[PDB]
Every structure is written in structure tokens, then in C-alpha cells.
């Protein structure tokens, strides 16, 4: 997709993840590295020793290299192996988790599927929810999506949709405030 990550950032983990995304997407593969990075994230939180190993800084470079090999020398894309070697050489191994997370983020941005959250005061009847799906479809009409619901507002009879990074307010509470403000400014 133009060998260009979604975003460019100067942070340590951001810099490495962008290079990995570019390099990976360059040769052929991104999904393979995604599983590798996803595996590291799950392991970083599930295995206590692995977390202590990464954070450990008194460890020598050769020692870090041997332990990584013991983990696994295969089932990791060559880019991932080269990335680990570079991190060991640059003493950046401690930041390996963040990189992983960050990478998946970018990957999840490339994912077309998105989750839409609707906020309404009144409980949404199943029949009403089906109508809402029809409206969201007709609005997009070209992308499949998963819907989520949430009802604990102060607004009433209003719908507010959150879609990843966009917010659309159809709440009646907004209408109430707007009218009370404009009526005040009549300047009769």
C-alpha cells in the first residue's frame, strides 16, 4: 500500500515500528509479523520471567542473544529476527513490547472492520435496533461494521454514535440547549 505506515512518529517505539511496518510490507508480508508481534505481547503479560528478562538491563548482549534463540529461532519472520538483533545491539530491547503493541495498532487501522458505539438514554428495543442498523448501513452502505450499545446518559431520546475517531451528536439534549440559548439572544 505504498510501503508507508499509517502515521509517522519520532518516538523510540514509533520509529522502530514504522521501519518494521515499511520493511515488512515491502518484501511481501505484514500478517506474518503481526502474529509474531501479537505472540510477544501475550507472552510479555502471561510469562513473568519473560517480562523480567526484557526489563532486565544488567544482562549482557551475548546473554540476551542466547536466551532469545532458546525461545525460538523459527516461526518468526526474518524481519522479526533482524529486529531483535538490532534491539540487542542498540540496548533497546526493553522497549520491544511497546513496539509490538504499536505495530498491531497500525495493523488494526488497516483493518476495514470498525466498531460503532451508540449512546441513548432509553433502552433500545430490538426492533428499534434493527432500524438503527438500517440507518447506519444506508449512511455507510459500503463497509461492514459491528455495533455496540451503551445506555447511561443524562441526555434523553437522543442518539450519539462513536465510530473509531468520529462523533455525531443527534441528541435532543443538544436541541434543548441550542434553543434556550438562541431564545436568550433574540435581542427584542
Amino acid at each position: 500500500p505504498g510501503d508507508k505506515p499509517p502515521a509517522i512518529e519520532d518516538s523510540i517505539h514509533g520509529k522502530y515500528a514504522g521501519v518494521l511496518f515499511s520493511s515488512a510490507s515491502s518484501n511481501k508480508s505484514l500478517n506474518k509479523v503481526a502474529e509474531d508481534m501479537k505472540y510477544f505481547n501475550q507472552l510479555y503479560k502471561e510469562s513473568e520471567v519473560f517480562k523480567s528478562f526484557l526489563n532486565n538491563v544488567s544482562l549482557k548482549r551475548n546473554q540476551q542473544r542466547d536466551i532469545i534463540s532458546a525461545l525460538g529461532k523459527t516461526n518468526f519472520n526474518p524481519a522479526t529476527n533482524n529486529l531483535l538483533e538490532t534491539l540487542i545491539e542498540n540496548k533497546r530491547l526493553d522497549s520491544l513490547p511497546k513496539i509490538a503493541e504499536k505495530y498491531m495498532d497500525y495493523y488494526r487501522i488497516l483493518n476495514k472492520q470498525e466498531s460503532i458505539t451508540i449512546i441513548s438514554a432509553q433502552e433500545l428495543t430490538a426492533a428499534e435496533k434493527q432500524k438503527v442498523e438500517q440507518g447506519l448501513k444506508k449512511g455507510n452502505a459500503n463497509v461492514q461494521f459491528t455495533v455496540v450499545y451503551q445506555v447511561d446518559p443524562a441526555i434523553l431520546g437522543g442518539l450519539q454514535m462513536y465510530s473509531g475517531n468520529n462523533f455525531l451528536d443527534c441528541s435532543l439534549l443538544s436541541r434543548v440547549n441550542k434553543l434556550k440559548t438562541e431564545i436568550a439572544k433574540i435581542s427584542f
Binding site: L43, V49, N56, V57, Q63, L71
Partner: protein
């Protein structure tokens, strides 16, 4: 690959390095200078605690950071 590779990593770690004593009570000096030492993995230590290095010289744990411990040495660096 497998998730149970923790034991593999644990076994490799215990052998390859003749180190890793009881980290909860011991630590390693990351750096020393300007009358300050950056100890590592001296967990369970208390602020103001008195630590002792190999040579016997002592120090007090002033700053307790996430990754390291800032200890002021009560003697010549």
C-alpha cells in the same frame, strides 16, 4: 512455537548466566558517577534504607524508580 516456552527461557537463563541471585534483596550497579549509583533490581528496598556494596562501602537508597534505584554512596566513588 509454544506459550509454555517460559520454562525453556527459564532453564536457559539459569544456566547461561552465573548470576541472578535473590533479586528481591540483591541488585547490580548499572552505573556509578558524580556521587550517585544507578542500582538495578534492588526490589523490596525502602526509601532511606542502607545498602552495602561488594567492597563493604555503604549507601542509602534515595530515589526509588521503576527500572532502577538511585543510591548515594557514603564514601569515595
Amino acid at each position: 512455537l509454544s506459550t509454555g516456552e517460559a520454562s525453556v527461557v527459564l532453564a536457559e537463563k539459569i544456566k547461561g548466566i552465573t548470576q541472578q541471585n535473590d533479586i528481591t534483596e540483591y541488585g547490580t550497579v548499572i552505573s556509578i558517577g558524580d556521587g550517585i549509583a544507578r542500582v538495578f533490581g534492588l526490589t523490596k528496598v525502602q526509601a532511606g534504607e542502607m545498602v552495602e556494596f561488594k567492597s563493604g562501602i555503604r549507601g542509602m537508597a534515595l530515589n526509588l524508580e521503576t527500572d532502577n534505584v538511585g543510591v548515594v554512596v557514603l564514601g569515595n566513588d
